[PDB]
Amino acid sequence: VSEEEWNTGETYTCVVAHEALPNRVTERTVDKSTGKPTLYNVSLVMSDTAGTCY
Amino acid sequence: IRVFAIPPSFASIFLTKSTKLTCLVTDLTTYDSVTISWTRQNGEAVKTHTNISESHPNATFSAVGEASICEDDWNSGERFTCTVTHTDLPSPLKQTISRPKGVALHRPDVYLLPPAREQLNLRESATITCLVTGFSPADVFVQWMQRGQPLSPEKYVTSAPMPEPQAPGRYFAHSILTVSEEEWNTGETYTCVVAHEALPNRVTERTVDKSTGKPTLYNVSLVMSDTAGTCY
Amino acid sequence: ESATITCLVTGFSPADVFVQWMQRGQPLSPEKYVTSAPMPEPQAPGRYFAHSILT
Amino acid sequence: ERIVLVDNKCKCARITSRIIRSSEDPNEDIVERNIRIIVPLNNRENISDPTSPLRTRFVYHLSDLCKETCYTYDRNKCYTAVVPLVYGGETKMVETALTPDACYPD
Amino acid sequence: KSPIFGPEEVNSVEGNSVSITCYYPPTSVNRHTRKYWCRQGARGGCITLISSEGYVSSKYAGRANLTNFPENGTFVVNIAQLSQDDSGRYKCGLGINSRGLSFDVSLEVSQGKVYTVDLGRTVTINCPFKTENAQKRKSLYKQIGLYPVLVIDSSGYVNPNYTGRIRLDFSVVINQLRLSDAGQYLCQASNKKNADLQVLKPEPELVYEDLRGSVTFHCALGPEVANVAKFLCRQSSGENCDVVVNTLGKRAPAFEGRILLNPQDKDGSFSVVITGLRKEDAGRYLCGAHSDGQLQEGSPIQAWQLFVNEESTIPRSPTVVKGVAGGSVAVLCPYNRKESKSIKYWCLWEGAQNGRCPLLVDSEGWVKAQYEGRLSLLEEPGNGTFTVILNQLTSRDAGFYWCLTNGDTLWRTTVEIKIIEGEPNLKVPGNVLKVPCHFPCKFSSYEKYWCKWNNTGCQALPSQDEGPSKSRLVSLTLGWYWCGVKQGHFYGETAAVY
Ligand SMILES: *[C@@H]1O[C@H](CO)[C@@H](O[C@@H]2O[C@H](CO)[C@@H](O)[C@H](O)[C@H]2NC(C)=O)[C@H](O)[C@H]1NC(C)=O
Numbered sequence: 007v008s009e010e011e012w013n014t015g016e017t018y019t020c021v022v023a024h025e026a027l028p029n030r031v032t033e034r035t036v037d038k039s040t041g042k043p044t045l046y047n048v049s050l051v052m053s054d055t056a057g058t059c060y
Numbered sequence: 061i062r063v064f065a066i067p068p069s070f071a072s073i074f075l076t077k078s079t080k081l082t083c084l085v086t087d088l089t090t091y092d093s094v095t096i097s098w099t100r101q102n103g104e105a106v107k108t109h110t111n112i113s114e115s116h117p118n119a120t121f122s123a124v125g126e127a128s129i130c131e132d133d134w135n136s137g138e139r140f141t142c143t144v145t146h147t148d149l150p151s152p153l154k155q156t157i158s159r160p161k162g163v164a165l166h167r168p169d170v171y172l173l174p175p176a177r178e179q180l181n182l183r184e185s186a187t188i189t190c191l192v193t194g195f196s197p198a199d200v201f202v203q204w205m206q207r208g209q210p211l212s213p214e215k216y217v218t219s220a221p222m223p224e225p226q227a228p229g230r231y232f233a234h235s236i237l238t239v240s241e242e243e244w245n246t247g248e249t250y251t252c253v254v255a256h257e258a259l260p261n262r263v264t265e266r267t268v269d270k271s272t273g274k275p276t277l278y279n280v281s282l283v284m285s286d287t288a289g290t291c292y
Numbered sequence: 293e294s295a296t297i298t299c300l301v302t303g304f305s306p307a308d309v310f311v312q313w314m315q316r317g318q319p320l321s322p323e324k325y326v327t328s329a330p331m332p333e334p335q336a337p338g339r340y341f342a343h344s345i346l347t
Numbered sequence: 348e349r350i351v352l353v354d355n356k357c358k359c360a361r362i363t364s365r366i367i368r369s370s371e372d373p374n375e376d377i378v379e380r381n382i383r384i385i386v387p388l389n390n391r392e393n394i395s396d397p398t399s400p401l402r403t404r405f406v407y408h409l410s411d412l413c414k415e416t417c418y419t420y421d422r423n424k425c426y427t428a429v430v431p432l433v434y435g436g437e438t439k440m441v442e443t444a445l446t447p448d449a450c451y452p453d
Numbered sequence: 454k455s456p457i458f459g460p461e462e463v464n465s466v467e468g469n470s471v472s473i474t475c476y477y478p479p480t481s482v483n484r485h486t487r488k489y490w491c492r493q494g495a496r497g498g499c500i501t502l503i504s505s506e507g508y509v510s511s512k513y514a515g516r517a518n519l520t521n522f523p524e525n526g527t528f529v530v531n532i533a534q535l536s537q538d539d540s541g542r543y544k545c546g547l548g549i550n551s552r553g554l555s556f557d558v559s560l561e562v563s564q565g566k567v568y569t570v571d572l573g574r575t576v577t578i579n580c581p582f583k584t585e586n587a588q589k590r591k592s593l594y595k596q597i598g599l600y601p602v603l604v605i606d607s608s609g610y611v612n613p614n615y616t617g618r619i620r621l622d623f624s625v626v627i628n629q630l631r632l633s634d635a636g637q638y639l640c641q642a643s644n645k646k647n648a649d650l651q652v653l654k655p656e657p658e659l660v661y662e663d664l665r666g667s668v669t670f671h672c673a674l675g676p677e678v679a680n681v682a683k684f685l686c687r688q689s690s691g692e693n694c695d696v697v698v699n700t701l702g703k704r705a706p707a708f709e710g711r712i713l714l715n716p717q718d719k720d721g722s723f724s725v726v727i728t729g730l731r732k733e734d735a736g737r738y739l740c741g742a743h744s745d746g747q748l749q750e751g752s753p754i755q756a757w758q759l760f761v762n763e764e765s766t767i768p769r770s771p772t773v774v775k776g777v778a779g780g781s782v783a784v785l786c787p788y789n790r791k792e793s794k795s796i797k798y799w800c801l802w803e804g805a806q807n808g809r810c811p812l813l814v815d816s817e818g819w820v821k822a823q824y825e826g827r828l829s830l831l832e833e834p835g836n837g838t839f840t841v842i843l844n845q846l847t848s849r850d851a852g853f854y855w856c857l858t859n860g861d862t863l864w865r866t867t868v869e870i871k872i873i874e875g876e877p878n879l880k881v882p883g884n885v886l887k888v889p890c891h892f893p894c895k896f897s898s899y900e901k902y903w904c905k906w907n908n909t910g911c912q913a914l915p916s917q918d919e920g921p922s923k924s925r926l927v928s929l930t931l932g933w934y935w936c937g938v939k940q941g942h943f944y945g946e947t948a949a950v951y
């Protein structure tokens with residue numbers, strides 16, 4: 007594909023077709039949005055009276 | 061020679077499906093010829109009773125005049141009246157009983173307070189106070205349980221619903237249980253169950269032990285793992 | 293919304309305790325707290341308690 | 348702008364992600380992993396049996412919640428237990444409501 | 454995002470009262486959970502001024518009440534006796550104060566001839582005079598820049614800022630008031646008088662709708678703007694309105710198949726249906742009446758405000774049904790499970806400027822004559838759905854197909870038929886006592902059956918089964934009739950014969 011596609015993505019599914027499958031389809035996809043993060047941020051908050059998970 | 065009239069609580073309606081109503085006659089002289097007839101607003105009679113009790117060792121007679129009605133009759137605010145016909149009182153008195161219509165339902169907020177750390181220093185006793193705030197109408201039914209087993213009624217004292225200070229038409233209640241300080245510094249989850257006619261399944265319950273409620277030590281130990289992962 | 297602080301006057305005898313509440317030195321209104329009448333304590337012998345909430 | 352990868356509500360994890368369109372240099376764009384755990388700290392181990400010990404370990408394998416023992420109540424799902432309350436003779440085991448305002452039947 | 458939705462901006466003068474509604478997704482938690490209205494102060498947090506359990510604060514005591522309509526799906530806060538300490542930043546919400554589930558109202562109180570008009574209308578600026586000047590050069594000037602600039606003179610001058618749109622009664626009538634012209638004027642004959650003209654911007658009319666639901670904009674306008682070419686813009690992030698319908702033709706590349714501009718009434722109260730609302734429709738919409746179908750000044754607009762909540766109870770039916778030519782489609786339209794006993798209908802698609810949706814079938818029975826033989830509305834499965842089967846396809850009967858119902862609250866589900874090229878999945882004689890029907894081996898679990906088609910649907914007709922047949926083959930031992938399949942409770946591929 008064009009390198010210029012990889013600011014906009016378009017998500018690029020690649021579907022295989024084999025005989026040991028239910029659908030005979032094991033479609034997968036990877037875009038720029040998938041793949042490695044290079045900036046985490048855990049943000050875990052703690053609170054006596056939580057426990058409802060809105 | 062007094063008289064008491066006992067309308068059914070909601071936690072006798074809901075909990076035994078037996079909306080029977082009584083009026084007890086005590087303080088009277090130990091005489092006989094008791095007739096305690098339950099009559100509606102139209103004067104008409106209802107079913108009779110049994111098990112009219114004994115006098116006291118203390119020589120003041122105690123009797124109990126029972127009837128059974130249906131639930132839909134009781135909720136419609138009908139006037140019921142027991143008439144006591146004794147040889148002492150020359151007027152056969154009426155005690156009037158009605159479930160007063162027009163009151164809203166509100167839900168009790170049950171907060172359960174653990175014993176003060178000024179009290180767990182004497183090593184004698186600890187007092188846990190269930191606090192049933194803000195409900196309506198009266199008649200909450202607090203009872204306690206220790207480790208899934210119902211505690212004996214000699215140990216807790218539930219108060220009566222006195223109306224709340226700021227809130228206009230909403231009551232509140234209390235219940236204190238005295239557990240010995242060795243039985244609290246072991247663990248020993250206690251639960252406070254309340255039953256009231258505006259709660260969801262009619263019943264709710266709270267719990268506390270040494271380690272949950274007002275602790276002096278918060279020991280979190282969290283672990284995240286595989287934080288990269290392959291997440292879709 | 294609102295906090296209910298509770299004073300648990302336990303263990304005494306005879307009746308007629310009198311609980312009142314002060315903030316910083318000058319006493320509060322009696323419209324805000326609710327003292328129960330004394331009730332007898334069941335585990336201990338004939339010694340009462342009471343309680344009084346302030347909201 | 349961001350896409351929710353996981354919104355798990357019985358551990359309360361909430362992994363999302365977002366591509367940061369940077370200063371307009373080449374493709375030095377970054378991708379994030381904004382985990383947001385919220386730790387209960389007064390819920391029991393068995394969430395439904397409230398006579399259990401408290402909790403110490405809160406373990407979040409974030410593969411095994413990207414694809415149980417829940418830590419928090421979910422808000423919409425409603426929880427119960429059954430207690431032996433008495434009133435007189437019988438021990439009528441009736442059905443309580445751990446979290447109320449969710450177990451109201453229609 | 455948090456699905457409560459209130460009024461984003463509230464304006465009311467001191468002493469007057471406020472009613473603030475906030476909506477919630479009517480679950481069984483949200484009906485019964487605590488509903489607050491807290492004041493987001495500075496330095497921190499909500500301070501609950503009036504909860505719904507029954508707390509009412511020290512400040513709002515005697516002047517506020519919060520009620521809760523759980524079936525309407527909303528809760529309303531009435532606040533009387535405003536002051537200027539009632540200005541600032543508020544939240545209406547549910548549950549605990551901290552955990553979101555809220556909306557942010559910004560309360561903003563204001564201090565107390567005269568005129569107050571909405572946009573584009575008329576107004577009659579009236580001014581008294583004396584008898585000694587009963588022929589003089591009467592005039593109206595505008596106070597900008599500490600000097601009356603000329604607007605209306607007697608001899609026939611009107612301003613370039615006010616060209617032509619105003620005549621002179623004494624008094625003076627202006628027409629097509631635009632918001633820039635909301636000025637505090639003055640009138641002169643040697644006497645004078647002031648003149649004051651506020652022109653309000655027409656307020657939102659909050660519409661909390663659902664994801665994959667539908668919405669009906671009820672545009673009601675006046676006998677001055679009956680024949681003006683009505684429209685519906687959508688005021689986006691700048692000042693421009695990317696128009697969505699028109700009456701002179703236009704529509705959007707986005708809203709294909711979905712906008713239905715209904716015909717005018719005698720009152721000019723045309724209505725607009727949007728369906729299949731997705732998350733990017735959630736903003737201000739504006740019906741209006743200007744000539745050239747774009748948003749211009751002088752146009753009696755009347756806005757709305759959508760909100761498309763994401764916490765739907767609406768189920769996710771497939772939007773694209775793909776049928777092969779001369780094949781079969783079998784679509785399910787979902788409908789409100791409370792509203793089971795009602796008269797279903799179906800539809801075509803015919804543009805927006807037309808904005809039509811004529812009825813193909815129903816549940817009482819009446820089918821269009823040009824669809825007879827190939828069409829049947831079903832009822833199985835019940836408990837939530839109703840199925841429609843259409844076969845004997847065609848290149849031009851692909852389109853957008855609306856699943857109406859005669860219920861109260863309506864989800865006009867639109868399903869899209871894609872007529873691809875293809876071969877039939879079922880083989881039947883051309884146009885025909887025994888008739889055969891030849892089923893592929895994929896329908897092995899499916900129950901093979903024939904129908905007698907009418908306006909009443911399918912009634913059963915017996916047959917006997919064979920073994921392996923080049924798959925499956927069934928007989929019709931013995932108008933239009935079909936030989937479809939059935940999978941437990943749903944329906945699949947049917948093919949018709951004469
Ligand atoms: C403790 O957790 C167990 C499983 O970890 C729960 O399991 C059973 O839960 C169902 C659902 O209410 C009950 O009908 C069963 O009777 C439970 N099993 C047993 C042996 O009690 C259980 O709910 C939790 N404990 C309690 C006492 O509720």
Ligand SMILES: *[C@@H]1O[C@H](CO)[C@@H](O)[C@H](O)[C@H]1NC(C)=O
Nearest residue numbers: 045046047048049367379381
């Ligand atoms: C996580 O990182 C992003 C980008 O660096 C940032 O915008 C966001 O605020 C961070 N998360 C929290 C909880 O602050």
Ligand SMILES: *[C@@H]1O[C@H](CO)[C@@H](O)[C@H](O)[C@H]1NC(C)=O
Nearest residue numbers: 276277278279280281282403
């Ligand atoms: C405090 O945390 C540490 C770290 O996990 C632990 O080893 C220690 O025992 C804890 N102490 C208490 C008093 O909980």
Ligand SMILES: *[C@@H]1O[C@H](CO)[C@@H](O)[C@H](O)[C@H]1NC(C)=O
Nearest residue numbers: 277278279280281402403404
């Ligand atoms: C605190 O938690 C850790 C981990 O469970 C435990 O090992 C430690 O003993 C705890 N502290 C106390 C005082 O129990």
